[PDB]
């Protein structure tokens, strides 16, 4: 698929707001994912044990993982579609080392969209959400094709 430049602008305009507080957004998004889809928390051996939202809020490792995941995603979006090198190491560790199903990447995309909508209503109207959804479907479709080359799902 191909986003137009106007779509990339809408995505990079709300991402510039997320980058004012990367750790806070990282926490919100990982907690929204785990509450909504608790099976995904089993994939993180260093968190697994967390039982409540309060325990998640207070975990410095979960907050670090959020910053690590958002920073890598931010670096992919800033490429505007030219992200093949960035995607290679990321597809290899999520398919072979962590074993993350494409479905889980759909769940986090949902959690990202939920959090931006709550925190940034004025920059995340319908056209900006449509553009972010397109950018995340592009990311999921390029990662799924890599998985398939790497010997996982496809």
Applying CB under 6 A, which residues contact ligand HEM? Answer: 40, 43-44, 46, 65, 68-69, 72-73, 90, 93-94, 98, 100, 104-105, 108
We find the least distance from the C-beta atom of residue 48 to ligand HEM, in angstroms, to be: 10
Of 21 and 39, nearer to ligand HEM (C-beta) is: 39
Of 44 and 148, nearer to ligand HEM (C-beta) is: 44
DSSP line for 85-100: HHHHHHHHIIIIII--
b/e 7-42 (16+ beta carbons within 10 angstroms → b): bbebbbebbeebeeebeebbbbbbbbbbeebeebbe
Is 57 within 8 Å of 27 (Cβ atoms)? Answer: yes
We find the least distance from the C-beta atom of residue 73 to ligand HEM, in angstroms, to be: 4
We find the least distance from the C-beta atom of residue 100 to ligand HEM, in angstroms, to be: 5
State the DSSP H helix or E strand holding residue 6, giving kind and residue range, or none if neither.
helix 5-18
Of 39 and 53, nearer to ligand HEM (C-beta) is: 39
What are all long-range contacts of 125-129, with beta carbons under 8 Å and residues at least 24 apart? Answer: 127/10, 128/10, 128/11, 128/13, 128/14
We find the least distance from the C-beta atom of residue 149 to ligand HEM, in angstroms, to be: 17
We find the least distance from the C-beta atom of residue 23 to ligand HEM, in angstroms, to be: 15
Question: Residue written as tokens 């305009």?
Answer: 13
Of 64 and 148, nearer to ligand HEM (C-beta) is: 64
Of 101 and 148, nearer to ligand HEM (C-beta) is: 101
């Amino acid at each position: 698929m191909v986003l137009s430049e106007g779509e990339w602008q809408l995505v990079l305009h709300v991402w510039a707001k997320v980058e004012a507080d990367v750790a806070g957004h990282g926490q919100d998004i990982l907690i929204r994912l785990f509450k909504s889809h608790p099976e995904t928390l089993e994939k993180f051996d260093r968190f697994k044990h967390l039982k409540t939202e309060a325990e998640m809020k207070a975990s410095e490792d979960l907050k670090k993982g959020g910053v690590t995941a958002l920073t890598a995603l931010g670096a992919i979006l800033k490429k505007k579609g030219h992200h093949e090198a960035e995607l290679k190491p990321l597809a290899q560790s999520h398919a072979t080392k962590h074993k993350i199903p494409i479905k889980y990447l759909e769940f986090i995309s949902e959690a990202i969209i939920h959090v931006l909508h709550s925190r940034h209503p004025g920059n995340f109207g319908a056209d900006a959400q449509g553009a972010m959804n397109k950018a995340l479907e592009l990311f999921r479709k390029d990662i799924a094709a890599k998985y398939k080359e790497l010997g996982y799902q496809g």
